[PDB]
């Protein structure tokens, strides 16, 4: 559409930072649910200022929205500094967007004498701070929006000049499945996260359990036949109860799925102090819903330990090595983790999973994509034992006698020995043998060395080694 191009802007900050306050300060001074403003573009143009009541909401609102977040603005109170939340908000941002702008709000609490040179204190700190972040170059704008406080605008048009500058470069695809994030509610006003629309289309409301029809839609001047991704319009629909859903998920019917467990693609956050231990609970926020699952990790094999990153699929045919801790720091190019939730969460496919750090350093740990969402409540009795997690369990024994040239004796294995008979075994010398208390080994081909070496020579290390493959869920196994 030649007129009215839209881009979403994530407004980030602390619970008392002035985020919600800077919107109105921008919208109001536009050219004279969510707020926004307009302006020409020398490639109209409107930018909805994403916001929310608090944090948790503003997070869950930015994760599943990532694919539509075009740029992140960072609000800061030029007195408190860079408060707690103002830090988490800065990484999640790094995950979703690709650029950001940092503004110093409340630029009225500084005395004129010590302000311009106290401003630079943070401008320096922020700059240096961002040096270790993909938002490494983010410009900074000192600005005071409500110069008095609650009851009682500074350099706002300036903040608009910048906002548009980095607001360049967008791309949107309508081919996906429909997804709209409701922020107003019978009418429904939200933002389109995935897919395309058209009058007469069918829409689902998983919160209410039903599919309604799009009687009409209206955004700014009424015309509307179809919307694309990133747009922000309102879907007029059946006079259902506009109360049960004042902010929720709407999409194509049968488009979402309810998941009891999922195979994410894992990736620790650098700034995460600590390890990533299999079986370590977490606070997972998947798409737009935060459910507490558990983890498990696993990795590829050494042969293709550096295979390309397949970030959209899953090559379920090949096997995978079990890992007790995320290998951080030759290494792997990426790894995964069979999440297992407590509550039947329910959300998109390939949705941007994130979740970490439950406890009584930063609180965020990793982030990943959802490459597969198990839907059966019995993912253990159905899909699970079929998986191929290689659990390399080793053993070692010591060789002693030499019955013949095709026989030896061993004694180890901390046993049963009637359930392992036949497994391919290898002596400390290099020859191969087939395990045929006590022991009974065979050998096709003994070697020349061990043949020379009761017994004789004092057995300078007749060592016996074993290596068998243990798929995590099958009953017992082989190797090769
Ligand atoms: N002193 C002062 N306070 C400001 C100024 N601008 C905004 N605020 C404060 O911003 C607070 C609201 O924060 P807000 O971002 O709406 O919180 P949220 O809506 O929970 O994110 C109000 O209580 C104001 O006191 C300002 O210019 N000077």
- Three-class secondary structure assignment of 407-445: EECECCCCCCCCCCCCCEEEECCCCEEEECCCCCECCCC
Rounded distance between C-alpha atoms, residue 104 and residue 188, angstroms:
34
Does any ligand 1 atom lie closer than 6 A to the CB of residue 149? yes
Centroid of ligand 1 to alpha carbon of 16 (angstroms): 6
Report whether 477 contacts 466 (CB < 8 A): no
Considering only CA atoms, which residue is closest to atom 3 of ligand 1?
Answer: 149
Residue found by looking up tokens 């970030």 in the block: 311
Pocket test for ligand 1, best of 10, 18, 57, 104 (most atoms within 8 A of CB): 18
Experimental method: X-ray
Backbone φ, ψ for residue 120 (5° rounding): -55, -30
Find out whether 146 is annotated in a ligand binding site. Answer: yes
Report whether 341 contacts 249 (CB < 8 A): no
Centroid of ligand 1 to alpha carbon of 67 (angstroms): 29
Backbone φ, ψ for residue 157 (5° rounding): -50, -35
CATH number at residue 77: 3.40.50.300
Centroid of ligand 1 to alpha carbon of 285 (angstroms): 28
Does any ligand 1 atom lie closer than 6 A to the CB of residue 21? yes
Backbone φ, ψ for residue 125 (5° rounding): -60, -50
Report whether 62 contacts 9 (CB < 8 A): no
- Which one-letter DSSP state was computed for residue 246? S
As beta bridge partners, residue 217 has: 235
Does any ligand 1 atom lie closer than 6 A to the CB of residue 145? yes
Is residue 50 packed enough to be buried (19+ CB in 10 Å), middle (13-18) or exposed (0-12)? buried
Rounded distance between C-alpha atoms, residue 298 and residue 263, angstroms:
10
Rounded distance between C-alpha atoms, residue 324 and residue 279, angstroms:
8
The three-class DSSP label of residue 476 is coil
Report whether 182 contacts 245 (CB < 8 A): yes
Does any ligand 1 atom lie closer than 6 A to the CB of residue 19? yes
Rounded distance between C-alpha atoms, residue 100 and residue 88, angstroms:
14
Report whether 471 contacts 391 (CB < 8 A): yes
Sign of CA dihedral 128, 129, 132, 138: negative
Find out whether 124 is annotated in a ligand binding site. Answer: no
Report whether 100 contacts 71 (CB < 8 A): yes
Does any ligand 1 atom lie closer than 6 A to the CB of residue 150? yes
Q: 112 lies in which domain range?
A: 5-166
Centroid of ligand 1 to alpha carbon of 74 (angstroms): 14
Does any ligand 1 atom lie closer than 6 A to the CB of residue 104? no
Rounded distance between C-alpha atoms, residue 193 and residue 48, angstroms:
14
Does any ligand 1 atom lie closer than 6 A to the CB of residue 158? no
Q: Which two tokens stand for residue 431?
A: 């020859």
Considering only CA atoms, which residue is closest to atom 18 of ligand 1?
Answer: 20
Q: Which two tokens stand for residue 264?
A: 């994410």
| Cβ density class 87-125: b for 16+ within 10 Å, e for less | ebbbbbbbbbbebbbbbbbbbbebeeeebeeebeebbee
CA 201 vs CA 72, 211, 225, 245, 347: distances in Å: 33, 10, 10, 20, 21
Rg (CA), the chain: 30
Report whether 201 contacts 225 (CB < 8 A): no
């Amino acid at each position: 559409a030649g007129r009215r191009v839209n881009v979403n802007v994530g407004v980030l900050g602390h619970i008392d930072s002035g985020k919600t306050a800077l919107a109105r300060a921008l919208s109001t001074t536009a050219s004279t649910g969510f707020s926004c403003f307009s302006v020409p573009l020398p490639a109209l143009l409107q930018v909805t200022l994403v916001d929310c009541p608090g944090h948790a909401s503003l997070i869950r609102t930015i994760i599943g929205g990532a694919q539509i977040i075009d740029l992140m603005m960072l609000v800061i109170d030029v007195t408190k500094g860079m408060q707690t939340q103002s830090a988490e908000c800065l990484v999640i941002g790094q995950i979703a967007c690709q650029k950001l702008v940092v503004v110093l709000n409340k630029i009225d609490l500084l005395p004129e004498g010590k302000r311009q040179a106290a401003i630079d204190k943070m401008t320096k700190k922020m700059q240096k701070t961002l040096e270790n972040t993909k938002f490494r170059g983010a410009p900074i704008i000192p600005v005071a929006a409500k110069p008095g406080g609650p009851e009682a605008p500074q350099g706002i048009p300036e903040l608009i000049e910048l906002l548009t500058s980095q607001i360049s470069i967008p791309t949107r695809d309508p081919s996906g499945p429909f997804l709209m994030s409701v922020d107003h509610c019978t009418v429904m006003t939200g933002t389109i996260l995935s897919g395309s629309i058209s009058l007469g289309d069918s829409v689902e409301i998983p919160a209410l359990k039903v599919v309604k029809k799009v009687k009409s839609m209206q955004m700014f001047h009424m015309p509307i036949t179809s919307a694309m991704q990133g747009d922000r319009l309102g879907i007029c629909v059946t006079q259902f109860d506009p109360k049960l859903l004042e902010r929720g998920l709407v999409c194509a019917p049968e488009s979402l799925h309810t998941v009891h467990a999922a195979l994410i693609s894992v990736e620790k956050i650098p700034y995460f102090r600590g390890p990533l231990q299999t079986k370590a609970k977490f606070h997972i926020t998947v798409g737009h819903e935060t459910v507490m699952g558990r983890l498990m990790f696993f990795s590829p094999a050494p042969d293709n330990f550096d295979q390309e990153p397949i970030l959209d699929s899953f090559n379920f045919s090949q096997e995978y090595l079990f890992q007790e801790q995320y290998l951080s720091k030759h290494c792997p190019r990426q790894q995964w983790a069979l999440v297992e939730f407590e509550k039947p969460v329910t959300c998109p496919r390939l949705c941007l999973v994130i979740g970490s750090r439950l406890d009584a350093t930063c609180r965020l740990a990793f982030h990943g994509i959802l490459l597969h969402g198990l839907e059966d409540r019995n993912y253990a009795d159905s899909f699970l034992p079929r998986l191929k997690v290689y659990k390399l369990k080793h053993k070692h024994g010591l060789v002693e006698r030499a019955m013949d040239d095709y026989s030896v004796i061993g004694r180890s294995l901390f046993t049963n020995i009637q359930l392992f008979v036949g497994l391919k075994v290898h002596l400390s010398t290099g020859e191969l043998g087939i395990i045929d208390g006590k022991f009974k080994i065979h050998i096709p081909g003994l070697s020349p060395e061990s043949k020379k070496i009761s017994a004789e020579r004092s057995e300078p290390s007749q060592h016996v080694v074993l290596s068998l493959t243990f798929k995590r869920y099958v009953f017992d196994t082989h190797k090769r």
